[PDB]
Amino acid sequence: LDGFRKWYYNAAGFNKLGLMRDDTLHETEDVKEAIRRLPEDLYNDRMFRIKRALDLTMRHQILPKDQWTKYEEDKFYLEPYLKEVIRERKEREEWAKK
Amino acid sequence: LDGFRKWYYNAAGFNKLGLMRDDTLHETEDVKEAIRRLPEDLYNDRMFRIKRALDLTMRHQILPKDQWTKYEEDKFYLEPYLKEVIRERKEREEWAKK
Amino acid sequence: QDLEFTKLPNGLVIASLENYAPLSRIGLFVKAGSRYEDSNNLGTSHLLRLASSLTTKGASSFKITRGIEAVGGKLSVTATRENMAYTVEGIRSDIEILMEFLLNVTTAPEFRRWEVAALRSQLKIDKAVAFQNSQTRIIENLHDVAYKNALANPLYCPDYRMGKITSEELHYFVQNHFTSARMALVGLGVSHSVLKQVAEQFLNMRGGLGLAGAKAKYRGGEIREQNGDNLVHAAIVAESAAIGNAEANAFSVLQHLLGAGPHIKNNTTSLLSQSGSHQPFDVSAFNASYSDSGLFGIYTISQAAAAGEVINAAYNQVKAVAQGNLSSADVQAAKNKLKAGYLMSVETSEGFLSEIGSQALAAGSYMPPSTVLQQIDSVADADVVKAAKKFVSGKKSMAASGNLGHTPFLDEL
Amino acid sequence: QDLEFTKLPNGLVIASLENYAPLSRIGLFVKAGSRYEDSNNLGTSHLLRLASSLTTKGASSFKITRGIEAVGGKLSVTATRENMAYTVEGIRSDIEILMEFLLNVTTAPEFRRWEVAALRSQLKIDKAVAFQNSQTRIIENLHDVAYKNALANPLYCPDYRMGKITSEELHYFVQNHFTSARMALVGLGVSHSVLKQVAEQFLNMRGGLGLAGAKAKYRGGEIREQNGDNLVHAAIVAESAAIGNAEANAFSVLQHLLGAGPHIKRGSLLSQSVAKGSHQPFDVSAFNASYSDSGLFGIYTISQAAAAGEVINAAYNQVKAVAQGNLSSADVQAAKNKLKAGYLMSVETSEGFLSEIGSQALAAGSYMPPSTVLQQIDSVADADVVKAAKKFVSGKKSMAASGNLGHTPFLDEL
Amino acid sequence: AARSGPFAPVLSATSRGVAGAVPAAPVLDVQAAARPLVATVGLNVPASVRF
Structure with a gap:
């Protein structure tokens, strides 16, 4: 599953835009x-x-392979901050529901 | 000529509406x-x-006669100022031609 | 019965009174006023005071607001230069979750950076609303010119410090001054046991004595700010006694002899007010005593033109009291005014909770209203005179504002 | 052609020099600084300074601006706490209409209310641009804490007074301080005669002595401004000599002994006394500002907030050494050479020469040849310098501080 | 002048008249005296000054 996730990460192609x-x-x-x-x-x-990434898509280019984003290296920075937004969002929703 | 003027005044009517x-x-x-x-x-x-004035026009009505302006009372508040605006305006214009 | 005060082994004071009131109040008192900052974290206590409804570790902001408003309870923060007090009040059937919310706010804040970034505009708005009246600005200016380091720090955040107060400064201030040895939990209308039992869930995290504050140093000086207000708000004070010293009382009797504001909704209500008079002007005596130092003086509002001699007249009246020119009936009336003011201050529930709170942090003990009455009585005529001479001699500090073309200086005053 | 200083009967002091220069310069000097206001008309001199291109009785604002820019001439206003100076400069073939414009601006303003209502926003903008640097704010604060009534008035308009200055206040200020006995018309590159003819067509009608100002009174004190700047600025001054005494020359020799600016790019008993103890960046100099009734002399320091204390102390200690006679005659000779070279380089330029003549005119009604001064500065002697020092080290001080003032000392500690 | 040394532009101000930039240099719903200040704020109750 880990190797197949790396293969899908390469197939998605946003790492080639950095x-x-x-x-x-x-x-x-x-x-x-x-x-x-x-x-x-x-x-x-x-x-x-x-x-x-927008400039590279404008010129229809990608980054060189040494400059791509390694699956292992990608950092889910927004994730922590996002969970909270969702948590707070749900809490508020529940309050209204009740 | 005052007779003419005063007469025209009443005729114009701007007096009636204060x-x-x-x-x-x-x-x-x-x-x-x-x-x-x-x-x-x-x-x-x-x-x-x-x-x-606007309100009166709305009702197609005029002020009680007494409240009407008087040819004599009428003061020209802006005249002194307006002249200046025109004077300044003209000066700038001639200077333009310079 | 009467208040109960267990001192827990981590230093936390617990005071309770069960009077079976329909609305019960619970407050928590910390020695974390604005005097504990320095020049690097000015205005941090103002943002801490305004940050009472921020997402706490235990409760999200939504709940800390919707849960207090759901039961109709009230959460408020009152702050002096020495002390902060977080107070909740509500029906007895909801004070369990009210203590949950209050103790979460006191003990475990989070201080998220986006929340304080949203709060700094509210800090500016609160400062503008507070300085809409001249007294607040002239008292802040008077403290700033009177003291050097500790009590000279303003209650409200300075204009440059807005936008610069961070989450780390708030966390450092809380971790250095919100410790158990500087905290008293006071509850009217609750059982002492629960307070003891709510003092374990929290108030157990920080057991230190906190980062003590520098000793306040007097500086003197006179600051005058032309602001246009037709009225020259002028305060002239000098160093006076600390809260505890016996001299303190003497100074309270001295302000009630000189005049502590009108008692009617406006004349011959003060030796000051009496001292000729053909114009509209207000003159009172100012006294603000903190645990290491006190300020006593005169406060005048007057028309700019007469601002001079009116101030001089008020000053001359205090000099008469410094020369022994007083009567015993006047001192007895001053004592009656002071004791009636104390009893009417403690007759309300929130004033009673504040008093108990203050006493706790200050002396760790509760002084029955009765005890005080006999101590105020202890103050005697000569004592009053003495405090006066202290003011009449000690270096003065003057804060003036308005059209100050005829407002005198300290070397002329 | 030595300035033909001549005092017309009214009081105007006309002075001129036909340097046969390509570009001449004509200025007019009035004793109408910010010290002549009181608490009711604060900031009026700032709006008067910024109102030089307004409509006059004789030329409109459009005519004045387009006519000065048509010949490429320059009209500027410089203001101190005592004096205002309106200066025009241009080619010799256009200085007739330049004197027309300048004398119309000085003598016959109109001060229309819509024009000053438009000018008050420019007043706010000019004050913000001026207080963009810390030295200006700390000197204004130092004067405000040092004096009581006259010299404590700021050069720039206070924040509350913007929106409140009217046409009547400007008219009252002009009618009470722009009189002929307080005015000198000074012209470099012009004939003296023309100055006189323009001095009769104008400058002769308003001829009272005007409204006398109050005597400035010293107060002392210290005003501090905590604003979180990277550097702490601090000025500590005391009362000193006034314009017209040899003790003013002694105080000028004393600031050039203590240090009055770097002669070399990127780099003084003070500077030496600070640098022997502190390795942080700093800038310590001596401040002297003398006006016709009173003077301020002291030290000015810029330093890192942390070292702000002892650096100030070190600078203060150095002045105390000069108050104890610890000085050498070669140092005083070098200070005299620095002061006289600074005076000669100040008067070597045309606008500085016109200002100097102007100031001398209003101050003493006479012109003092550069040479004369040189021998008077020489008159100052070592003991004299020491004397002025003791005046500073003893007289009550006034302190203006700004920055992170957690380690900045007070006057009772200083 | 002579006295100016290096503080001239500080003791003097010169308007350009005719010949970094300014960095972009509110209203809230609106006596007694001398009772020391104690500012108070609340979750529900509006904040106030107890001058």
């Missing part, structure tokens, strides 16, 4: 709240990575 | 400038006068 996994999340309301709660350095790296 | 000559000057660029320069009191007064 992106992380959390860069590829669709910005819903909860995702934008989690992005707003990021520290300044992580937010700046995320915006630069997104801008570089 | 409005001095100045109150009835179209707001061209220059007039607008002078209006701004107006000391606040005259401005606020001007406004009530105009607002009042």
